[PDB]
Structures are given as structure tokens and as C-alpha cells.
Amino acid sequence: PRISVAAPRLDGNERDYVLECMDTTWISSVGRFIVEFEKAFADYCGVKHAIACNNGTTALHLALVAMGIGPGDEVIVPSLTYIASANSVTYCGATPVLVDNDPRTFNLDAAKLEALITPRTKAIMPVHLYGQICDMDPILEVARRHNLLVIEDAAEAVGATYRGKKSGSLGDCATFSFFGNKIITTGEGGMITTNDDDLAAKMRLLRGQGMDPNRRYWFPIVGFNYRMTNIQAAIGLAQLERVDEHLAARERVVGWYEQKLARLGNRVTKPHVALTGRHVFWMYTVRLGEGLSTTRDQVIKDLDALGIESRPVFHPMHIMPPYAHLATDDLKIAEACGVDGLNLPTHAGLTEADIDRVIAALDQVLV
Amino acid sequence: LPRISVAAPRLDGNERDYVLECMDTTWISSVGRFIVEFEKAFADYCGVKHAIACNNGTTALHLALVAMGIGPGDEVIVPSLTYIASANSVTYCGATPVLVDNDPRTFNLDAAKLEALITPRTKAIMPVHLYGQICDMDPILEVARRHNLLVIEDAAEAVGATYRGKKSGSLGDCATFSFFGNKIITTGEGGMITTNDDDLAAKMRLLRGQGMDPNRRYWFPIVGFNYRMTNIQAAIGLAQLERVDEHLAARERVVGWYEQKLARLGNRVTKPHVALTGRHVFWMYTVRLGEGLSTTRDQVIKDLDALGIESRPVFHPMHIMPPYAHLATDDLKIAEACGVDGLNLPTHAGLTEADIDRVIAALDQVLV
Numbered sequence: 001p002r003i004s005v006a007a008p009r010l011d012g013n014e015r016d017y018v019l020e021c022m023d024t025t026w027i028s029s030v031g032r033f034i035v036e037f038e039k040a041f042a043d044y045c046g047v048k049h050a051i052a053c054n055n056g057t058t059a060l061h062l063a064l065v066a067m068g069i070g071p072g073d074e075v076i077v078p079s080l081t082y083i084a085s086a087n088s089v090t091y092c093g094a095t096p097v098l099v100d101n102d103p104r105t106f107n108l109d110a111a112k113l114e115a116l117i118t119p120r121t122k123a124i125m126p127v128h129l130y131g132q133i134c135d136m137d138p139i140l141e142v143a144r145r146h147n148l149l150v151i152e153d154a155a156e157a158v159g160a161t162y163r164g165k166k167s168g169s170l171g172d173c174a175t176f177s178f179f180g181n182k183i184i185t186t187g188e189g190g191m192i193t194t195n196d197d198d199l200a201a202k203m204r205l206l207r208g209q210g211m212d213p214n215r216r217y218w219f220p221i222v223g224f225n226y227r228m229t230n231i232q233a234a235i236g237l238a239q240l241e242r243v244d245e246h247l248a249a250r251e252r253v254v255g256w257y258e259q260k261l262a263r264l265g266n267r268v269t270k271p272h273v274a275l276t277g278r279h280v281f282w283m284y285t286v287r288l289g290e291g292l293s294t295t296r297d298q299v300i301k302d303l304d305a306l307g308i309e310s311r312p313v314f315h316p317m318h319i320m321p322p323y324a325h326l327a328t329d330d331l332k333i334a335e336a337c338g339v340d341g342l343n344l345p346t347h348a349g350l351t352e353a354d355i356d357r358v359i360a361a362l363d364q365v366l367v
Numbered sequence: 368l369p370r371i372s373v374a375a376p377r378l379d380g381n382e383r384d385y386v387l388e389c390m391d392t393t394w395i396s397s398v399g400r401f402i403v404e405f406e407k408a409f410a411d412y413c414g415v416k417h418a419i420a421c422n423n424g425t426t427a428l429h430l431a432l433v434a435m436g437i438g439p440g441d442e443v444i445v446p447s448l449t450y451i452a453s454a455n456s457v458t459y460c461g462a463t464p465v466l467v468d469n470d471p472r473t474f475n476l477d478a479a480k481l482e483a484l485i486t487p488r489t490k491a492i493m494p495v496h497l498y499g500q501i502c503d504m505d506p507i508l509e510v511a512r513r514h515n516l517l518v519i520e521d522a523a524e525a526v527g528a529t530y531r532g533k534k535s536g537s538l539g540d541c542a543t544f545s546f547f548g549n550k551i552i553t554t555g556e557g558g559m560i561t562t563n564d565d566d567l568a569a570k571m572r573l574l575r576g577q578g579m580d581p582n583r584r585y586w587f588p589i590v591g592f593n594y595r596m597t598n599i600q601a602a603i604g605l606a607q608l609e610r611v612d613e614h615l616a617a618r619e620r621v622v623g624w625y626e627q628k629l630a631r632l633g634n635r636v637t638k639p640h641v642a643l644t645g646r647h648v649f650w651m652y653t654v655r656l657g658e659g660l661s662t663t664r665d666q667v668i669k670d671l672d673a674l675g676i677e678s679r680p681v682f683h684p685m686h687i688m689p690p691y692a693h694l695a696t697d698d699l700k701i702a703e704a705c706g707v708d709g710l711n712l713p714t715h716a717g718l719t720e721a722d723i724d725r726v727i728a729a730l731d732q733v734l735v
């Protein structure tokens with residue numbers, strides 16, 4: 001049987017809640033679950049406001065637009081990330097300023113921020129890869145000192161914490177994704193968290209085609225159609241109800257990899273865990289050893305043939321066509337990680353036998 | 368006394384079943400079989416080669432325009448009388464809309480005002496088939512062709528409509544539809560692009576999927592978007608589309624009722640004119656208030672609401688609102704006249720003959 005790199009576990013009230021939507025006929029972007037989901041997600045992150053959106057990409061765009069990011073502005077974004085992070089900046093007419101990441105946590109290197117600030121910088125986008133929150137204290141300190149905004153792309157870290165705070169409550173705003181491979185899913189769906197009244201209002205106005213609440217077909221600004229549906233919210237609220245279960249499940253999966261690792265010896269380097277809060281392990285990510293004869297890419301092809309799905313750590317932005325014009329000589333760790341990084345199957349339905357197969361496979365494939 | 372809504376989804380087919388299927392199979396994201404299935408049924412319905420499912424008709428519009436290469440410094444002719452997504456979608460591209468006036472009877476793009484708005488920057492024209500009625504496509508296509516311009520139909524309100532033998536979605540280079548809750552066919556939130564051009568279609572699909580190389584994980588040749596429709600939306604859409612004919616017949620019957628009963632109102636409303644070019648699907652039955660009335664359009668909508676009946680105004684033309692006031696010209700009068708006197712009456716598959724008598728009775732009481 002095939003082992004998927006990811007998959008949602010719909011073991012709560014998803015089905016009943018969706019049925020209710022169907023049965024009530026509230027299936028569009030108008031229904032109770034949207035507000036309920038938002039209320040509950042806000043409460044779960046300990047922030048005042050949650051804005052449900054259509055996906056974690058339009059969440060990023062919407063948050064940046066509402067923040068006033070536009071032509072001329074610069075936003076610092078790590079090169080090692082999912083493209084939506086830099087794409088969202090480009091949609092605004094703004095310019096991404098790529099920064100290197102840490103070789104252990106894969107995350108934005110705070111020590112490299114300052115050299116990048118210019119008179120055009122407006123925000124910094126820490127991205128919490130693989131379930132692990134960036135070292136926020138120093139990023140916030142650099143930001144404060146420069147009157148910059150911080151937006152967390154927290155799409156891969158729902159439930160993670162940093163020094164007592166949940167992801168989503170640390171920067172001026174944060175975005176999350178609920179695509180089907182994420183910790184909690186809505187199928188496709190996203191959310192923006194923030195504690196700022198103004199920012200939140202602007203986001204809801206923009207999300208809703210920019211229409212004015214009191215005048216039918218009265219639009220004061222150019223908006224977007226970024227609403228989530230009642231059905232996405234229903235699924236979402238149900239998943240959030242079992243969020244701790246979901247998280248305990250990846251902890252079970254990670255515990256299995258962690259205790260079987262020695263069979264791989266120095267052939268992989270295991271995901272390093274910063275001691276700053278909970279690391280949620282959206283994906284259990286290793287760096288293959290410099291010494292193999294095989295290539296990270298061939299490794300994925302071999303595993304596939306072995307019936308196991310896996311993914312590469314992202315290709316850094318500045319090595320791909322859309323962003324090669326942004327390359328600098330100080331993006332070496334991103335390059336290295338993109339080269340040797342591999343996401344192993346990590347989801348709530350994996351059994352210990354699954355994990356045993358993944359380990360056996362790699363033992364065989366890493367030459 | 369339950370309220371009569373202007374619109375409402377009629378989920379009287381296999382929507383629930385298909386949707387439970389998605390749940391039971393765990394395929395609820397933009398990965399699942401109903402997507403391709405729906406696209407295929409829809410393309411066949413419209414008589415075209417390709418259908419690209421998207422998360423709403425606004426992003427369908429943006430997607431189509433980026434795929435057609437609309438960009439900064441390009442002009443796209445858009446009617447001022449339309450839903451804002453029409454003009455916003457061009458804006459998203461960094462392109463400039465060039466407003467055109469509409470026909471006073473059909474509410475549609477006035478092809479005779481088209482040629483004059485063409486410049487060195489024009490790249491496309493976007494006819495909008497308001498209210499289920501297809502624009503007079505022949506003359507529009509003749510001008511487009513003569514100046515080598517693309518044509519994108521904004522067919523959101525016209526699923527099922529036909530024009531001189533062809534379905535909406537099949538006349539310009541591409542077309543877009545909306546499956547928002549109040550649409551003829553719904554997916555709650557959803558949209559579609561139709562096209563017979565292989566190239567355009569493939570570009571759309573690449574952009575719609577975050578611009579990722581289908582043969583190279585996390586390798587992106589260009590900047591794309593997250594515009595994919597989910598399996599659940601696609602399941603509702605397929606089921607809806609399965610009963611497209613019943614849905615269009617339900618509406619015809621309602622429109623028949625308005626047609627028969629409106630005489631009780633006399634010259635107090637102007638009944639929507641229907642061109643003999645093809646099938647008018649009546650997403651909304653639209654009247655223009657009598658010029659003779661003492662009352663105002665917004666007052667009539669207020670009075671009906673109070674009477675427990677929902678209604679909507681004909682769209683405020685883009686040039687009169689803040690985001691586009693800068694595009695105003697002195698030749699958008701009919702659009703203005705229409706935004707002033709137009710009213711969409713409740714139009715949907717769940718309305719009964721008694722509901723209509725009630726609506727007509729309310730008009731009789733409030734059109735003073």
C-alpha cells in the first residue's frame with residue numbers, strides 16, 4: 001500500500017457540520033460556521049481577530065494589502081520558503097528582499113536582517129517552516145528599532161508556540177493555510193490573525209469585494225473575492241475542535257522516526273528543535289549527508305518506487321525564474337538546504353509499520 | 368409570512384450525495400475527481416473544448432486576463448454598467464479599463480459605441496451578459512476582429528444562454544462564469560473559464576496552480592496564483608449542472624408568471640426587453656421603473672423589504688463610484704439612467720406562483 005507524504009484525518013464533526021450546511025442550504029460565503037470558526041481560531045491563538053479566507057495565499061495577499069504594502073515598498077522574505085510568501089509581495093506591486101535562513105531550523109536568520117533594511121523597507125515576513133517558529137524576539141527587536149511591521153506566514157505551524165505565545169499572535173498579523181496537507185484542513189482555506197482593530201477592519205472590507213456594508217453595490221475601494229465558504233469553515237471548526245488530538249498524532253509519528261533513526265547513521269541529519277516553544281512538526285524534515293553518492297532527487301524517485309511519497313525542501317526563490325533577479329551572494333544556507341532537504345511522510349494516519357517502512361526504504365536508498 | 372429572497376440555491380439534485388462522497392473518500396481539497404468531471408461536463412454543456420474550474424468568478428476573470436497577457440499599459444473595454452469584478456479584474460492586471468455605455472433595453476454593451484473607444488493600447492473588449500441575456504455578439508466580434516482584439520465574455524449571469532446557435536462561454540476567445548450562491552448554477556463560491564484555445568487553456572491551468580511545473584515539484588517557471596476550486600465545490604457544481612435544464616425551466620416558469628401578471632402594473636414598470644438572438648436565461652427578471660412615478664428606486668426597494676420582499680438595484684455604473692470615478696466620460700448616460708431606475712425582482716427556482724402574486728401585489732402598493 002502507498003504511503004502519502006500527508007493527508008487529513010477527518011475524525012471529528014466534519015461530516016455532520018458539512019451535512020448541516022448542505023441541509024440548511026447555507027453553502028456559500030454566508031453562514032454561522034465562518035464567524036464561529038474565526039472566533040474559535042482567534043481564541044485558539046490568543047489574538048483578538050481572525051479573518052477567514054479562501055486559501056493561505058490570498059490570506060497573505062490580503063494581509064499585505066491591508067497593511068499598505070504597495071509599489072516601491074520592500075518586504076523582507078526568506079528565499080527558503082513556499083513561493084506564495086514572495087508571490088504575495090509581488091501581487092502588491094512590492095519588492096521582496098530575500099534573506100538567508102538558519103542551517104538547523106531552516107528559518108529566517110535574524111542576524112542577517114539588519115544589513116537588509118533600506119529606506120524602502122516596510123515589513124518583514126518570518127515564515128515558520130515545518131512547524132517551528134522563527135526566533136521571534138530578535139526579529140521583533142530589529143523591527144521595532146526600524147518601525148517595520150512583521151507579518152508571520154504561519155501556514156505550516158498552527159499550534160506552535162514561542163515563549164508562551166501561539167503562532168499567529170507574535171507579529172502585527174500572521175497568515176495560516178488550511179490546504180489538505182496541513183495540520184488542520186478545510187480542503188482549501190486560510191485565515192489572518194491580528195490584534196489590531198484597524199488592520200482587521202480593512203481586511204474584512206477588502207475580503208468582501210470592498211463593498212460598503214450599508215450600500216448594495218456601493219464600493220468605496222477595489223476589493224477582492226477572498227471569502228471562505230460556510231462549508232470550509234464547518235470542516236475547519238470541526239478540525240480545530242480536535243486540534244490537540246491532531247498535534248498528539250504528529251508527536252506520535254515523530255517519536256517513531258526519532259527512536260528508529262540510528263539505523264540511518266550520519267546519512268541524514270535530523271530536524272533540530274529550537275528550545276523556544278512547541279515545534280508542531282507539520283513535516284519531519286532531514287538533511288541528507290554530504291557524503292552520499294546519490295542525490296536528494298534520486299532519493300525521492302527511489303522512495304517512490306518503494307511506494308513512499310516524499311517532498312524536497314523548497315527550491316529557494318532566487319534559484320527559480322520568477323525570482324532569479326533577486327539573487328545575492330548571501331543566500332548560501334538556503335541553497336544548501338534546498339539541495340539536501342527532504343520532507344518525510346508526516347500525518348495523523350501513519351502507523352509505526354509505516355514509519356518502519358520509511359526507515360527501511362531510506363536505509364536501502366541512501367548510498 | 369416568510370420572506371421572499373431575491374435568489375437562492377435550489378439544491379434539489381445529487382449535491383448532498385456527491386459532497387458526502389468527497390467527505391467519505393477524504394478528498395476535500397483541490398485534489399479529487401469531481402474537478403475534472405465538472406470541467407468536462409461544463410465544457411460539453413457550453414460546446415467548447417476546455418473548462419478551467421476556479422475558486423470564484425472574480426478570480427476566473429483575473430486568471431483569464433493574466434493568461435491572455437493583459438497587463439500594465441493595456442486597455443480593456445468594459446461596460447460601466449456591470450458588477451465591479453468586471454473592472455476590478457483588469458485593475459488587478461495593472462491594466463486600464465475603458466468604459467463603454469450599454470443599450471437601454473438590454474442593459475448590454477452598446478456595440479455601436481465600441482469602435483470609437485479603440486486606441487493603440489486596447490487589447491481586449493469584455494462584453495458582460497447581464498441578467499442572463501447575451502450581448503449582441505456579432506457586431507462586437509466584427510469590430511474586435513477588425514482591430515485584432517481579444518474578446519472575453521464575462522458570462523457570470525448567463526449560464527445556459529444561447530446566441531445565434533452558440534452557448535454563452537463559446538463566443539469570445541474565452542469566457543468566465545460565477546457559481547456564487549445566487550447564480551443559476553452554484554458551488555456556493557466558485558467559477559469557470561471556458562475556451563477552445565489549447566494554448567490559453569494550458570496557460571490558465573498553469574497559473575491557476577500556483578504557476579508550478581507539473582513535472583517538477585516546487586519548481587515555478589512563473590508567478591501564479593491559488594485559484595483552484597475544491598472537490599466539494601466541484602461536486603455541488605456537477606450535481607447542479609446535472610439538472611441545468613430543470614433549473615432553467617423553473618426560472619422560465621417564474622418569468623412566465625411575471626410576464627403574465629405584470630399587466631396589473633401598467634406603465635408603472637418597464638418589463639425587461641428580450642432580443643430574439645437566442646435564449647435569455649433570466650438570472651434576474653429586471654424592470655426599469657416608470658418615469659412617471661413620484662417615488663424613487665431605492666424607496667421602492669425599502670418598501671418591498673418592509674413588505675417582506677428582497678430585491679436589488681441595477682448596478683451603480685463604475686464611473687459613479689470612488690474607485691472608478693476617474694474613468695468617467697460624458698457618454699455613459701444610458702448606464703447612468705439604468706443605475707437610477709433599474710430593479711431586479713426575486714428570480715430563482717424556488718419561487719412559487721403565489722410568491723409572484725405577492726411580489727406583484729407589493730409593487731402595486733409601492734409604485735406611487
Ligand SMILES: C[C@H]1O[C@H](OP(=O)(O)OP(=O)(O)OC[C@H]2O[C@@H](n3cnc4c(=O)[nH]c(N)nc43)[C@H](O)[C@@H]2O)[C@@H](O)C[C@@H]1N
Binds near residue numbers: 004005181309
Ligand atoms: C507546502 C505546499 O504544499 C502543497 O504542494 P504539494 O506538496 O505539491 O501538494 P499535493 O497536492 O501534492 O498534496 C500533498 C499531499 O497531501 C495530499 N492531499 C491533499 N489534499 C488532500 C485531501 O483533501 N485528501 C487527502 N486524503 N489527501 C490530500 C496529497 O495527496 C499529497 O499526498 C501546496 O499546495 C501547498 C503548500 N504551499
Ligand SMILES: C[C@H]1O[C@H](OP(=O)(O)OP(=O)(O)OC[C@H]2O[C@@H](n3cnc4c(=O)[nH]c(N)nc43)[C@H](O)[C@@H]2O)[C@@H](O)C[C@@H]1N
Binds near residue numbers: 026030372374450555
Ligand atoms: C451580483 C452579485 O451578487 C452578489 O452580491 P449580493 O446581491 O449582495 O449577494 P448576497 O450575499 O446578498 O446574496 C444574494 C442572495 O442569494 C442568497 N444566497 C447566497 N448564498 C446562498 C446560499 O449558500 N444558500 C442560500 N439559501 N442562499 C444564498 C442570499 O441570501 C441573497 O438573498 C455578489 O456576491 C456576486 C454577484 N456578482
